[PDB]
Amino acid sequence: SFPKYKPSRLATLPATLDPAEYDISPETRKAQAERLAIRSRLKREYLLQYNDPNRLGVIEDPALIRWTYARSANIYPNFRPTPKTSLLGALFGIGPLFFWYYVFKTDRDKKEKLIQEGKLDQTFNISY
Amino acid sequence: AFSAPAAYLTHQQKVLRLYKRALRHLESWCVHRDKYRYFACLMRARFDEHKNEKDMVKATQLLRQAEEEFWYGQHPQPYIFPESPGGTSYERYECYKVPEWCLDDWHPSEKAMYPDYFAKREQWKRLRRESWEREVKQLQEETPPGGPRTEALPPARKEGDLPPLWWHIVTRPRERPM
Amino acid sequence: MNPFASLTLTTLTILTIPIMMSNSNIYKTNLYPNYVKTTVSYAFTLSLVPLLMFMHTGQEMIISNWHWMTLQTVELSLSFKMDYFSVMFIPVALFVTWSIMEFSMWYMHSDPFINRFFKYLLLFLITMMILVTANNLFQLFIGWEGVGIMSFLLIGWWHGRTDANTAALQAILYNRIGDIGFVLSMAWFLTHSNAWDLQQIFMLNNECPNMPLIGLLLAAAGKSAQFGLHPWLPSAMEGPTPVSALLHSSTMVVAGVFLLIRFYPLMETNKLVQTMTLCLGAITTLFTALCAITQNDIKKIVAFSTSSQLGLMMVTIGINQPHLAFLHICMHAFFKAMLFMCSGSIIHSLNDEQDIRKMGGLYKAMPFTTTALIIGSLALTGMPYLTGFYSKDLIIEAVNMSYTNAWALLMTLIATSLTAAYSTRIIFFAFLGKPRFPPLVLINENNPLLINSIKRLLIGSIFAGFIISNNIPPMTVPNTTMPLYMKMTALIVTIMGFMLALELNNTTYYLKFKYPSQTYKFSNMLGYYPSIMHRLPTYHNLSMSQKSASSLLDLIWLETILPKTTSFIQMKMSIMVSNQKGLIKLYFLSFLITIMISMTLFN
Amino acid sequence: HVTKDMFPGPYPKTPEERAAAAKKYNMRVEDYEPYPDDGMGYGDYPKLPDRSQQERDPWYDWDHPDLRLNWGEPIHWDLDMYIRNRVDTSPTPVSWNTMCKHLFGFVAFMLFMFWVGEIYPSYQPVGPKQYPYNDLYLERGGDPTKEPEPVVHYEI
Amino acid sequence: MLKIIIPTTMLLPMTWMSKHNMIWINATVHSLLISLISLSLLNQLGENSLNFSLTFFSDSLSAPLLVLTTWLLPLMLMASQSHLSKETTTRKKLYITMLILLQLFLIMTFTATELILFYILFEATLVPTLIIITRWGNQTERLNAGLYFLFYTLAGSLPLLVALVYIQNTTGSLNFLIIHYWSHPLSNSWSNIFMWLACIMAFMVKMPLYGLHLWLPKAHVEAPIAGSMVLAAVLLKLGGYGMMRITTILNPLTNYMAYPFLMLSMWGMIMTSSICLRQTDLKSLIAYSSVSHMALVIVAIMIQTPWSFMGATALMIAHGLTSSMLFCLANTNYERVHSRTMILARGLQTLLPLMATWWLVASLTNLALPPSINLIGELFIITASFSWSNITIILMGMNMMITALYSLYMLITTQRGKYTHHINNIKPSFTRENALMALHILPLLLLTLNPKMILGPLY
Ligand SMILES: CCCCCCCCCCCCCCCCCC(=O)OC[C@H](COP(=O)([O-])OCC(O)COP(=O)([O-])OC[C@@H](COC(=O)CCCCCCCCCCCCCCCCC)OC(=O)CCCCCCCCCCCCCCCCC)OC(=O)CCCCCCCCCCCCCCCCC
Ligand SMILES: CCCCCCCCCCCCCCCCC[C@@H](O)O[C@H](CO[C@H](O)CCCCCCCCCCCCCCC)COP(=O)(O)OCC[N+](C)(C)C
């Protein structure tokens, strides 16, 4: 035996260490066959449109269109005001603003108090 | 690369892949030639010990301990051929690869130079224009109903036939176009 | 007027003529690289004259020639500082660039865009000369950013390669992290000293505060690839070997150190920033040497050597010895440029192979490269009376004889050990054994360009230290008296490194094999810094910038608040108001109700 | 050329529309799995494995060799985050936790030891450097109209 | 000032009486001549202003914007020549009429000695842009975009009008000169707070402010190329010009009232820069980059120092030129590929090298590479902000880093790598497109030689 490899989100499990590939059953082989069949049908359609001498443009990709549409225009109709969504929206959209406001307000209050007290030493400060 | 993939890898394919990978990483560890030869003979003797095994369940229990051992001792910086997918010149010359259709957009003054080349080019284009209309029918009649099951293409079976979908394989730019 | 002033400006000006002729006919021919090389050689021999004048009398000038915009009490002008640092660094950089271009005419011969490569090399040289001679912070920033853009363009020279583009963007990212501190320093100096000019900054800051110096230190760490911001320099080896030898080895990467040298009157008045500089340099030199001693790519080993040398320069700055740091810059230029040139010769002779496991006995197969690499390694490790001796020996003596951190001193000594170790690693694995390259032997050194370009820097690496050290005036008090053992510390540490690394390398011939340790794994994957820090932050940034900023706020909530709420409210109000069944019974009942309300409400 | 029925829709609730959505994305019904039905606008879009494009087979003949994609296959929601120019998830020789521990251990020990060396510095058996004229009072800041206290240096 | 206004009006009869195949040539020639004429307003004074008459006056804040506005029309005509080729003569003439009307409204808006006249022309500009977007836009979302672009604006602009007339009832005048000379402090009151908000929000929504910026990606993605050019180059700068003009009567209430807008801008510039990193659309990416730059301009105007105003002027001019160039490059790609998706057409440096050089220069100037005027404005604003508070340097540096990141990401995605195999309709770039890019970029690098021309009245 040897020390174990532990996968993570950003360092995934290697293919050759998966228990899944070594559990072969007829349903698994059938699923692999159908996956290869789908990929081969798509490849045949693409190459048929690709090798055509009469085609003179972009081969339109429905998968890319679906990707861009889902990323951009399908978000709001599928939005639902949810405790998770509401809390994350409020946090990520308001908390930074108030955090930065507090920081800058404290900094400028300290600076203003110092300049009123005269102990700031602003010599040679001509450009603002 | 050139050959089409299958739905799955068999057991002996997995064993041979592990053998090649282990020997490559062993020679990465064993820099010198004689040391590598010695330890490679040891590795081969270790592989062929279970060569005649008939219990497939026990054989699959094997190769799993073997791949775990490989991952433990896999030389985190293996040697890679420079043009291989991890090498130092893997995609170095892709910026010099230009498609063949770009020549269609050359100015006539540019095509005035190299007249023989362009004449051969229209020869090729006519060949493609006829062969394609024949190839579509050939592929249509040869393909099982319900779509292809494997992404393998048939050869030319008649006399004047050309292999279907041959154009973009035959007219590859070059390995070193410039 | 005085000749000294005219010569300094003419060097920089005639460096730009091939760029003007880049649109002419010569740029379309095969004579353009030779034209650029000849121009650079003429600029070098012309710049040798102000160096002689300074060596004779010490002539110093400021040339504020063109008045650019004036901002109320702040005046901005094109001004050049021609002090000792400028008039000493310009000839060295020009000499190195001349050798590099002559080497490139042999190395990049089959490249279709070789004129563009030389045009690019010249543009980098011009930007670096702008950086070095700048008298104000805006001009220095111009050079700062120009060298960065040129490095981005030259790393991603093969733009069809994904890794080259990744490395170029990496360099840009880390240098922008440093640019934050650069811009902070500019803002502070303008707000408090009312100038970006160096004379007014020195005059008005008798005791410089922490903030501007910390900004300068952050900029220097970014551009010299110190420990926090180090990986981009080894990642930059994606570019062609001449680019690695010129930019990322000896000229551009010292820029950050040069910045700290340029502001040394203010640095010497602050103890905290000095201590931070010293500690950063010590950890950088140790960590990069530790990563180097276990690498298999030869260019990676030389890049890690460069990073360790830069860390040593930062240590010298941190012990308040800026002139010695400048001298180290000048010496390292020579011998590290020759080191990369030898590496590129090996790579070309072995069909673009960079792994040392696949190069064997080249001691006899190609002997001029062998002797040049031996001389360069002896200069780098520090061999008495060579170019690296006159700087590194004094560096180690000064660090020993000073009131410093004990940890920084220890790390510097261990880094010297590791320098000897990776030098002997390169020699042993690339020249001493049996051949391990493919059977078709294409080994060939017989090209006048390669031989001449390498031998010029070889003569430099042999004699330049003696000549320069004996010609410059003394800028510091010497360390005349030392304990005998503490005088011999550098040599004994170097010998210990040589012997121990040679002994550990000789065991690879034994017929026994064992799996590596955790220390080896840590050293080989670069402390795992590139892994974690290039996967954890980036992902968490990118994911966030799509999940929260783009979808959650911009596409959902900012949309929900103003426009969607207005649309919903108006839609409901319209549906309520307009939906009347047309029954005048209800209309006149409403009329009666409003009549009585008007009677009971407004009087 | 894309019809109204070929665009992403709302989260599928029934097995029939689940199968229809799996058909839309050119993938098996068994392999199809939408994102969990929360307020986020994922709707009806496959949740593909979170692997990077660097983990895809480089020896397969892709239609887009540099991106390692085929023409008709479904695209991961975060494709532009995994493009071999950006974050990748490829397995490493050492575990992520082990690398984090070692890198963290090294950095923390270095910082602690630099602090310790600050507490316990190094120097030589010498006294302060001596300068002649009142420690160069006039040459370091000046103020000649004050006549500071003289400092006399000891001959030994 | 009529020597510029009258030729612009004469552009209309000249357009409508032109031959069917002579409209573009004549319009371009005479627009270039009008630009040359307008170039003589750059001779400004260190004294008050160039007060031509009771109705129009010129300033060193007004003159650079006027020159940019005049220079933009010929470029818009060149860019629109291509996609409007299959169009009827009457509709091409109507498009050119919309462009000329927009120029006339902008020219009169920027001089406009009166605040009510400024408001009237400032809102008159809203009509031709709306028609251009909703009529000659390609997608079905253009109508929606127009609606947004309209109502947002009016949501801010109706209160301003009320405040404006209110001011004249108390002051007695809305002339900029009398307003400036007779300014009196604004007390810290609820009435004065709401007057301040009414005065500010109209110009704040048009920058746009980070919270109110949703209309901009819609309008830019949906508009034709000339519409995008004029929106990014000139129409966004109306808010900056108006704020600089009107903040003279809002003191000292600006010190307290500026905090929410300052926080919104300093955080939203980071937010929009990060948004640019994950964007599948070129036009949307360029729009978000514009939002970030205008956030920096808002910070500059709110800080309200001499260096802030100089940096704001320089950044407005520089961003106008750079964003117009970026939109033109993206449109040249779109007219070939018809997709507008960044990931689709790749490796274009190998197929179109000179256009790759144009892309590189535009990305470098968007990245604020010194000594470009982009960086001059950036650095002046950053220094003013540092004096305002030393902690702003964190957000400014982060914004600079993210800006470099997405600029080079956009360059590398489209120009580097391997070409897409199935795209074979990529033709060599036309002389018209190369000349368009050159006419965008050479003025920027010339302006860096004489920066005081674009540094405003506080120079
Ligand atoms: C005051 C008196 C002065 C005199 C003092 C004494 C003088 C010298 C005496 C010598 C003393 C030791 C020297 C031996 C060096 C090691 C050589 C060796 O055996 O390596 C093989 C061996 C394993 O090799 P392998 O796995 O079999 O490799 C397979 C093949 O060989 C693969 O091989 P390859 O072909 O791939 O490449 C070979 C490569 C691969 O080898 C490696 O794996 C590299 C790693 C070992 C070398 C590192 C040495 C320097 C370490 C600096 C560390 C600084 C602090 C870091 C803090 C980290 C702690 C987290 O090795 C080399 O290149 C040569 C090694 C370089 C050594 C030569 C010069 C350095 C010695 C200097 C020592 C100090 C004197 C300084 C002089 C001035 C005096 C002030 O290495 C080790 O086992 C490591 C031993 C030492 C490492 C120390 C780090 C341990 C940290 C553990 C955690 C501690 C707790 C921390 C607390 C945290 C709290 C949060
Ligand atoms: C949405 C996308 C962006 C859009 C633009 C956003 C920017 C608009 C933000 C408005 C700026 C601030 C408004 C008023 C600032 C004055 C300071 C005051 O609010 O704070 C305290 C005031 O105390 C309380 O805040 C009283 C007001 C509480 C009621 C306001 C509702 C709070 C949250 C509502 C936010 C919704 C904004 C959008 C509306 C559609 C100060 O204490 P006090 O010394 O006593 O008052 C001094 C001022 N005096 C002298 C004139 C009286």
Residue-by-residue DSSP string for D23-35 = HHTTS-TTT--BP
Tokens of C291: 């990563």
- Terminal C-alpha separation, chain E: 23
Question: Does residue A127 belong to the interface with chain C, where contact is any CB pair within 8 Å?
Answer: yes
Containing C47, the helix (H) or strand (E) segment is helix C32-57
Alpha carbons B114 and E241: distance in angstroms, whole number: 60
The C-alpha angle E334, E336, E340, rounded to 5 degrees, equals 25
- Terminal C-alpha separation, chain A: 69
Q: For chain E, how big is the Rg over CA atoms in Å?
A: 21
Alpha carbons C124 and B91: distance in angstroms, whole number: 25
Cβ proximity of E309 and E439 under 8 Å: no
Alpha carbons E154 and E158: distance in angstroms, whole number: 6
Contact check, Cβ <8 Å, E278/D66:
no
In chain B, which residues are last before a break of more than 2.5 Å from C to the next N? Answer: none
Cβ proximity of C478 and C398 under 8 Å: no
User: Please, is C224 exposed, middle or buried when counting C-beta atoms within 10 Å of its C-beta (0-12, 13-18, 19+)?
Assistant: buried
Cα dihedral across residues E217, E218, E224, E229: positive or negative:
negative
Which residues of chain C neighbour A1 with C-beta distances below 8 Å?
Answer: none
Cβ proximity of C339 and C430 under 8 Å: no
Q: How far is the CA of E193 from the centre of ligand 2 (A)?
A: 9
> CB neighbours of E62 closer than 8 A, spacing ≥ 6?
E41, E110, E111, E241
For C197, C363, C420, the CA distances from C509, given in Å and listed in that order, are: 61, 18, 21
Alpha carbons C422 and C339: distance in angstroms, whole number: 13
Q: Which of E273, A119, A99, E383 is nearest to C215 (CA)?
A: E383
Alpha carbons A103 and B31: distance in angstroms, whole number: 59
User: Please, is C73 exposed, middle or buried when counting C-beta atoms within 10 Å of its C-beta (0-12, 13-18, 19+)?
Assistant: exposed
Q: Check pocket membership of E252 for ligand 2, CB cut-off 6 A.
A: no
Tokens of E308: 């802030």
- Residue D69 is classified by DSSP as B
> CB neighbours of E301 closer than 8 A, spacing ≥ 6?
E240, E243, E244, E247, E308, E309, E312
Q: How far is the CA of D97 from the centre of ligand 2 (A)?
A: 48
Containing C351, the helix (H) or strand (E) segment is none
Q: Is C484 helix (H, G, I), strand (E, B) or coil?
A: helix
d(CA A15, nearest CA chain B) in Å: 10
Count CB-CB contacts under 10 A for residue A59. 17
Contact map slice: D 5-64 vs B, CB within 8 A: 58-61
- Residue E198 is classified by DSSP as H
Tokens of D2: 């894309």
How crowded is the C-beta side of C282, counted as CA atoms within 13 Å? Answer: 26
Q: Is C404 helix (H, G, I), strand (E, B) or coil?
A: strand
Tell the residue number behind the tokens 């005649």, with chain if given.
B52
Alpha carbons C159 and E348: distance in angstroms, whole number: 11
Q: Which of E204, E200, E207, E211 is nearest to E271 (CA)?
A: E211
Question: Does residue B149 belong to the interface with chain A, where contact is any CB pair within 8 Å?
Answer: yes
Q: Which of E161, E169, E170, E187 is nearest to E251 (CA)?
A: E187
Alpha carbons B154 and B158: distance in angstroms, whole number: 12
Alpha carbons E233 and E228: distance in angstroms, whole number: 8
Q: How far is the CA of C415 from the centre of ligand 1 (A)?
A: 11
Cβ proximity of D76 and D48 under 8 Å: yes
Tell the residue number behind the tokens 């009157």, with chain if given.
C265
Q: Which of E65, E79, E53, E60 is nearest to E1 (CA)?
A: E53
Ligand nearest to the CA of C428: 1
CA-closest residue to ligand 1 atom 41? C520
Count CB-CB contacts under 10 A for residue C120. 16
State the best of A78, A84, A88, A91 to mutate against chain D, taking most chain D CBs within 10 Å: A78
Q: Which of E17, E41, E48 is nearest to E30 (CA)?
A: E17
Containing E58, the helix (H) or strand (E) segment is strand E57-58
Q: Which of E271, E259, E206 is nearest to A93 (CA)?
A: E271
Alpha carbons E63 and E111: distance in angstroms, whole number: 9
Q: Which of E315, E318, E283 is nearest to E296 (CA)?
A: E315
Contact check, Cβ <8 Å, A126/C555:
no
Q: Check pocket membership of E193 for ligand 2, CB cut-off 6 A.
A: yes
Alpha carbons A127 and C71: distance in angstroms, whole number: 9
d(CA E389, nearest CA chain A) in Å: 7
- Dihedrals phi, psi of C76, to nearest 5 degrees: -110, 130
Peptide bond into A77 cis (omega under 30): no
Alpha carbons E218 and E153: distance in angstroms, whole number: 14
Q: Is C80 helix (H, G, I), strand (E, B) or coil?
A: strand
Alpha carbons B119 and C424: distance in angstroms, whole number: 60
Cβ proximity of D11 and D30 under 8 Å: no
Number of alpha helices (DSSP H) and beta strands (DSSP E) in chain B:
7, 0
Cβ proximity of E82 and E335 under 8 Å: yes
Which residues of chain E neighbour A69 with C-beta distances below 8 Å?
Answer: none
* Structure resolution, Å: 2.8
Alpha carbons D10 and C121: distance in angstroms, whole number: 56
Of E349, E419, E427, the CB nearest to B99: E419
Cβ proximity of E32 and E114 under 8 Å: no
How crowded is the C-beta side of C380, counted as CA atoms within 13 Å? Answer: 37
Tokens of E216: 């901009």
Which residues of chain D neighbour C290 with C-beta distances below 8 Å?
Answer: none
User: Please, is E46 exposed, middle or buried when counting C-beta atoms within 10 Å of its C-beta (0-12, 13-18, 19+)?
Assistant: exposed
Tell the residue number behind the tokens 């992520």, with chain if given.
D96
Q: How far is the CA of E191 from the centre of ligand 2 (A)?
A: 12
For A126, C91, C183, C188, E367, the CA distances from C211, given in Å and listed in that order, are: 19, 34, 12, 8, 26
Of B31, B82, B178, the CB nearest to C508: B31
Mutate to test the pocket of ligand 2, among E152, E190, E192, E193 (most ligand atoms within 8 A of CB): E193
For C422, C425, C429, C451, C499, the CA distances from C503, given in Å and listed in that order, are: 13, 11, 13, 33, 6
Give the torsion through C-alpha atoms of E47, E48, E54, E55, to 10 deg: 110
- Dihedrals phi, psi of C68, to nearest 5 degrees: -90, -165
- Terminal C-alpha separation, chain C: 99
Question: Does residue B94 belong to the interface with chain E, where contact is any CB pair within 8 Å?
Answer: yes
Cβ proximity of E415 and E348 under 8 Å: yes
Ligand nearest to the CA of B30: 1
Contact check, Cβ <8 Å, A40/B151:
yes
d(CA A67, nearest CA chain B) in Å: 25
How crowded is the C-beta side of D93, counted as CA atoms within 13 Å? Answer: 19
Alpha carbons E221 and E141: distance in angstroms, whole number: 9
Which residues of chain A neighbour B151 with C-beta distances below 8 Å?
Answer: 36, 39-40, 43-44
d(CA A101, nearest CA chain D) in Å: 29
> CB neighbours of E312 closer than 8 A, spacing ≥ 6?
E240, E244, E297, E300, E301, E377, E381, E456
Tokens of D90: 């490829």
Cβ proximity of C315 and C282 under 8 Å: yes
Question: Does residue E178 belong to the interface with chain C, where contact is any CB pair within 8 Å?
Answer: no
Containing C27, the helix (H) or strand (E) segment is none
Mutate to test the pocket of ligand 1, among C287, C288, C294 (most ligand atoms within 8 A of CB): C294
Cβ proximity of E107 and E5 under 8 Å: yes
Alpha carbons B43 and B40: distance in angstroms, whole number: 5
C561 CA closest ligand 2 atom index:
1
Contact check, Cβ <8 Å, B8/A50:
no
- Dihedrals phi, psi of C355, to nearest 5 degrees: -85, 130
Strand partners, E341: E281
Which residues of chain D neighbour B71 with C-beta distances below 8 Å?
Answer: 93
Query: What are the percentages of helix, strand and coil residues in chain E, rounded to 5?
Result: 75, 0, 25
Of D9, D10, D70, the CB nearest to A39: D70
In chain E, which residues are last before a break of more than 2.5 Å from C to the next N? Answer: none
Q: E237-246 and E62-83 helices cross at what angle (nearest 10)? A: 160
Q: Is E341 helix (H, G, I), strand (E, B) or coil?
A: strand
Question: Does residue B74 belong to the interface with chain D, where contact is any CB pair within 8 Å?
Answer: yes
Cα dihedral across residues E200, E204, E206, E212: positive or negative:
negative
Contact check, Cβ <8 Å, C161/B91:
yes
Contact check, Cβ <8 Å, E349/B95:
yes
- Terminal C-alpha separation, chain B: 23
- Determine the residue type at D66: D
